[PDB]
Write an enzyme that holds these catalytic residues in place. Structure first.
Site, PDB file in Angstrom:
ATOM      1  N   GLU A  24       0.838  -1.116   0.181  1.00  0.00           N
ATOM      2  CA  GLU A  24       0.007   0.044   0.049  1.00  0.00           C
ATOM      3  C   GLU A  24       0.694   1.175   0.070  1.00  0.00           C
ATOM      4  O   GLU A  24       0.132   2.409   0.173  1.00  0.00           O
ATOM      5  CB  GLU A  24      -1.074   0.069   1.269  1.00  0.00           C
ATOM      6  N   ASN A  35      -0.305  -7.617  -3.858  1.00  0.00           N
ATOM      7  CA  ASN A  35      -0.876  -6.829  -4.890  1.00  0.00           C
ATOM      8  C   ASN A  35      -0.024  -6.071  -5.483  1.00  0.00           C
ATOM      9  O   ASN A  35       1.276  -5.565  -5.064  1.00  0.00           O
ATOM     10  CB  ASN A  35      -1.684  -5.753  -4.234  1.00  0.00           C
ATOM     11  N   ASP A  56      -7.014  -5.766  -4.459  1.00  0.00           N
ATOM     12  CA  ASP A  56      -6.115  -6.150  -3.613  1.00  0.00           C
ATOM     13  C   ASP A  56      -6.248  -7.479  -3.109  1.00  0.00           C
ATOM     14  O   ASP A  56      -6.026  -7.813  -1.807  1.00  0.00           O
ATOM     15  CB  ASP A  56      -6.313  -5.143  -2.504  1.00  0.00           C
TER      16      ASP A  56
HETATM   17  O1  PQQ Z   1       0.918  -5.322   0.952  1.00  0.00           O
HETATM   18  C1  PQQ Z   1       1.206  -5.570   1.956  1.00  0.00           C
HETATM   19  O2  PQQ Z   1       2.702  -5.303   1.815  1.00  0.00           O
HETATM   20  C2  PQQ Z   1       0.548  -5.976   3.117  1.00  0.00           C
HETATM   21  C3  PQQ Z   1       1.168  -5.940   4.402  1.00  0.00           C
HETATM   22  C4  PQQ Z   1       0.487  -6.477   5.471  1.00  0.00           C
HETATM   23  C5  PQQ Z   1       1.114  -6.633   6.694  1.00  0.00           C
HETATM   24  O3  PQQ Z   1       2.477  -6.559   6.818  1.00  0.00           O
HETATM   25  O4  PQQ Z   1       0.624  -7.080   7.706  1.00  0.00           O
HETATM   26  C6  PQQ Z   1      -0.984  -7.055   5.074  1.00  0.00           C
HETATM   27  C7  PQQ Z   1      -1.530  -6.753   3.779  1.00  0.00           C
HETATM   28  N1  PQQ Z   1      -0.923  -6.373   2.704  1.00  0.00           N
HETATM   29  C8  PQQ Z   1      -2.994  -6.847   3.490  1.00  0.00           C
HETATM   30  O5  PQQ Z   1      -3.160  -6.806   2.062  1.00  0.00           O
HETATM   31  C9  PQQ Z   1      -3.793  -7.507   4.362  1.00  0.00           C
HETATM   32  O6  PQQ Z   1      -4.937  -7.974   4.030  1.00  0.00           O
HETATM   33  C10 PQQ Z   1      -3.345  -7.664   5.566  1.00  0.00           C
HETATM   34  C11 PQQ Z   1      -3.910  -8.281   6.971  1.00  0.00           C
HETATM   35  C12 PQQ Z   1      -2.931  -8.321   7.868  1.00  0.00           C
HETATM   36  C13 PQQ Z   1      -3.105  -8.801   9.175  1.00  0.00           C
HETATM   37  O7  PQQ Z   1      -2.012  -8.912   9.810  1.00  0.00           O
HETATM   38  O8  PQQ Z   1      -4.246  -8.884   9.726  1.00  0.00           O
HETATM   39  N2  PQQ Z   1      -1.932  -7.680   7.097  1.00  0.00           N
HETATM   40  C14 PQQ Z   1      -1.811  -7.534   5.940  1.00  0.00           C
HETATM   41 EU    EU Z   2      -1.797  -5.702   0.360  1.00  0.00          EU
END
Ligand code: PQQ
Ligand code: EU
Ligand code: PQQ
Ligand code: EU
Lengths: 576, 576
Positions: free
Chosen positions: B172, B256, B299
């Site tokens: 993101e 993504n 995503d």
């Molecule tokens: O695109 C990214 O770098 C990234 C990192 C992370 C993260 O580091 O926890 C999540 C997501 N995306 C993501 O799309 C997502 O739905 C998500 C849920 C969680 C969580 O720990 O509940 N982390 C992340």
């Molecule tokens: Eu993501």
């Protein structure tokens, strides 16, 4: 309060912090007892959403449990009909975070009061707030204390009649100790009673100490201080309050006289620091007062609870007040007049030989009185006292007391203190260590104590100070927690531990017991280490300077507390 | 790693996050089983000293349990011989607090790795750190990610041979996703394998996708993007890694493709975002890769675990890879080559009709593909996916999968995104709600799924998303937690709940089971709500802007999560 007088007698309820107005911390419930307590297991738990010290305990009123946290003082109502609970409401007050900087002894709060469909809470930054008990909505709030003057509030308020009574903290910040009474419906302040200063501010009734003028009288709030030192006089009011409706008196104790450098207070008793007050709740006027530690040089705050049992004295049933003071003496007074009936040490004491029955004053050992620029070595108890705020329990079945205690001593050197409003006003270098002048390998004990005989009936040595106030029951049990996280049930007759479980953080909460809507007995306690002895852990302080935390850092590391526990904030509820 | 290959087969141990290199999350322990699990009670607990989301789980290696917390990433070793435990050591890294501001989805960490007498941890602020497993002494540390570019680390590292493999977060934030390998003894970086860009950065072996050129090849890391949009191309690597030593391949998925506004990525597949990679651990070079979601507009990160079971396919024992993707399809691939064996929905899917058997690409429903400046309504699953990071389990006894799932949908509008290094690079307005286009009254489910048949066997509807990765055992049990704090054991044959207890905070930890030094079986889990769905609670976000937290705030409030749980951080350990 009429509702509370009725509710406090109901075995299933826990409607004020120490069970009842007499502060006995005793429950008539006996579903859990010495024959079955080994089957006790966790029923449920609830996170308070905060870290650092979790003092006091929850209230249970009707089918609702009320829970409170350390700063920032989250408050929750749990609906106990929802199998096992649902969060009925929550409230978090807006606070000035500068409060954290002026808390002496961790960001603790000793808990809620309940009356007339309302919950009353205090906040570290000095507010008294009334909430609707069923919705959690704010009804009124008042600013009782000012953090810019080094004031905080950590004590639990008490509701008496149509008033909520609120104290203040800051005996290490030159604060003028006082108790304020607020109308429970409007929040309008009705009176404010100071612990020092002119009679107009202290509030004395016409019969004040009538029977015992040797205990002090008019003018002593200023005349027992040099110059105008009473203006920074401490006598704060952060402990537990009790009440006898039959006598129309509420009772509490007052803190150290401000600066820890007694040289700057030399020449008088420094009344009414380190004092037991009995006051009329309608007007705040004092009926009697007894000062336990005149001209304190040890930080022996007088704020510990005032238990109100009826004991047999010389074969006569007598309305008593029993108080286990920081100074190491267990006091028994007639709660009508302040007559001193007995005072004997409940821990090892070497600052005084005894409390004289000739004049009701300590017979001091001069070599243990502190002074400016010269260290005084091997004073017992240390400033954390024979016990600190953690409240004792009384069983009317056995007629004995169950007392969490400290086993520690100190070196204490006075140094000149300069006052700046909002900054510490201490004036001492303090080094703390284990009991009997650093000879012992343990720092606490849980005891059974006969107040009139001055006898330890039995003792459980504890590695850490016992910073948890027991609940005692008709099942023949006392429950308490340890600072390395053990929650324990002890047989009150034998002193034997019958059940124990290691929880996630040191326990400085006071357990309760209650009946759920299912008519089942539960035992509940907060976990989350902190308070003064736990400050090295709660505030993540290094070992490099053992004098830090006014002696608490050095002793905590010596005892191994930082290796024994992490911070947390959890309510644990047990049942068979 | 040869030590780990031996250790992972020992029933009493739990030496990597998902039990073993195949990520099956399966234990052969059968002391606790469907007949006696009703006798499970809390044995002990341990506070992690942190609040907010507690993901991953502890490790048990020898007689030591290793525990980790949310930011600031406290690490503890608990000596399980000390009745029930003592804290053997603790470590907290110094971090750049700016990491907190560039964490998309709560300040979680998925946990520790162990190898060769060392513990390996990642930090939110982008460090990989090696500690002495016996003393907690810091041996080496390296900077792997840069918070000033919007990079963080939340994933658990994996040790393979003499290398620790470390990913990055920031899909993101326009981050270039990659996996780095560091020598476990010196900390020296050995290679760095990117998810996009030129071949020299992606790292392809000479036989890359040899059998399936239709899955892509050399040059696709730039050629499948407009201009140099791959420079902000995402494909981050924050999920779980797996390894097959017999094939000398490790496996993982990628996030993504950066901006959520697909219009700015139009013209190609955006490889290798949303991709399953198989790479050689010695060199980082890819042997094969399969992109699940070309030109993503939802995503649908590809990072979910790559379980490596040996399944019977048309009567033939076959080394498979099974992956339950965010996009809602359960994929079965030949793990030697990336051949697609099966791909069927494990949740309700309406963005695609199927995965084409002709070209292994989703057959999209054009009305559900998002666009710039116009809303697209009723997309299932939503961006949190059919399941998010919470890992599934596999039983070799049943041949079936036990999968925590989400039941949600969304509206999603693309918006023009401008890149500023260190600031968000999203470009979407998203509103989330319950499953089947808002018709359902529940937001999660725990299922048993037959991957080859592409069919659910049974399902437990759950009010909240199931954000806890189960452990499955030879006792016929699956354990998982719910976001309102219930820890549950279910019969794997039927889905019947056999045992449950309400803990203090929502559970987003993945439970483990192990043998203590006493040779008794324990089950352990973290409590402490947070992660993406829990962000409204963890970050205390108000309900007035439901678009906040990339849509997570609105849906959490609609599901009632803020009324159901408080924040916490506690390890709970159960036994019979
Ligand atoms: O695109 C990214 O770098 C990234 C990192 C992370 C993260 O580091 O926890 C999540 C997501 N995306 C993501 O799309 C997502 O739905 C998500 C849920 C969680 C969580 O720990 O509940 N982390 C992340
Ligand atoms: Eu993501
Ligand atoms: O003089 C004061 O105003 C004051 C306040 C407090 C407090 O508010 O907690 C403590 C003390 N003194 C004190 O002397 C002391 O030993 C102490 C221990 C604790 C605790 O919660 O563990 N509070 C306090
Ligand atoms: Eu004090």
């Amino acid at each position: 309060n009429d509702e509370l007088i009725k509710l406090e007698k109901e075995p299933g309820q826990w409607v004020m912090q120490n069970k009842n107005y007499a502060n006995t911390r005793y429950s008539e419930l006996n579903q859990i007892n010495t024959k079955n307590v080994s089957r006790l297991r966790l029923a449920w738990s609830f996170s308070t959403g905060a870290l650092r010290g979790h003092e006091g305990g929850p209230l249970v009123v009707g089918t609702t449990m009320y829970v409170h946290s350390a700063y920032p003082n989250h408050v929750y109502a749990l609906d106990l009909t929802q199998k096992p609970y649902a969060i009925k409401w929550q409230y978090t007050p807006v606070q000035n975070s500068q409060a954290v900087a002026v808390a002496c002894c961790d960001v603790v709060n000793r808990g809620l009061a309940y009356a007339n469909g309302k919950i009353f809470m205090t906040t570290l930054d000095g507010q008294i707030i009334a909430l609707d008990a069923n919705t959690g909505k704010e009804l009124w709030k008042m600013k009782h204390a000012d953090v810019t003057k080094g004031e905080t509030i950590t004590g639990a308020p008490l509701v008496v009649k149509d008033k909520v009574l609120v104290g203040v903290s800051g005996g290490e910040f030159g604060v003028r100790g006082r108790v304020g009474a607020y109308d429970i419906n409007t929040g309008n302040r009705v009176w404010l009673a100071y612990s020092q200063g002119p009679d107009e501010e202290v509030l004395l009734d016409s019969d004040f100490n009538k029977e015992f003028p040797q205990h002090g009288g008019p003018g002593d709030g200023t005349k027992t201080w040099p110059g105008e030192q009473w203006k920074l006089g401490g006598g704060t009011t952060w402990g537990w309050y009790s009440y006898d409706p039959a006598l129309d008196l509420f009772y509490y104790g007052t803190s150290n006289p401000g600066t820890w450098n007694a040289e700057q207070r030399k020449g008088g008793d420094n009344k009414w620091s380190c004092t037991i007050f009995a006051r009329r709740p309608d007007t705040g006027k004092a009926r009697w007062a007894y000062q336990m530690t005149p001209w304190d040089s040890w930080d022996y705050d007088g704020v510990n609870e005032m238990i109100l049992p009826d004991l047999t004295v010389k074969g006569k049933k007598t309305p008593c007040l029993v108080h286990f003071d920081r100074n190491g003496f267990g006091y028994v007074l007639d709660r009508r007049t302040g007559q001193l009936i007995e005072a004997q040490p409940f821990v090892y004491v070497n600052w005084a030989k005894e409390i004289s029955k000739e004049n009701d004053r300590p017979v001091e050992i001069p070599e243990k009185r502190t002074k400016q620029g010269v260290d005084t070595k091997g004073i017992c108890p240390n400033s954390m006292g024979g016990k600190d705020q953690q409240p004792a329990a009384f069983s009317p079945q056995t007629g004995l007391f169950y007392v969490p205690t400290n086993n520690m001593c100190m070196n204490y050197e006075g140094v000149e203190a300069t006052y700046t409003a909002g900054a510490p006003y201490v004036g001492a270098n303090v080094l703390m260590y284990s009991g009997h002048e650093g000879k012992d390998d343990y720092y606490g004990a849980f005891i059974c104590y006969d107040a009139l005989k001055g006898k330890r009936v039995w003792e459980i040595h504890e590695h850490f100070p016992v910073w948890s106030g027991p609940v005692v029951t008709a099942g023949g049990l006392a429950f308490y927690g340890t600072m390395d996280g053990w929650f324990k049930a002890v047989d009150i007759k034998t002193g034997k531990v019958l059940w124990q479980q290691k929880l996630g953080s040191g326990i400085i909460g006071n357990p309760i017991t209650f009946l759920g809507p299912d008519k089942k007995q539960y035992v509940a306690v907060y976990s989350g280490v902190g308070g003064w002895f736990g400050i090295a852990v709660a505030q993540n302080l290094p070992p490099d300077d053992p004098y830090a935390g006014l002696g608490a850092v050095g002793v905590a590391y010596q005892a191994g507390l930082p290796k024994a526990t992490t911070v947390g904030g959890e309510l644990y509820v047990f049942a068979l």
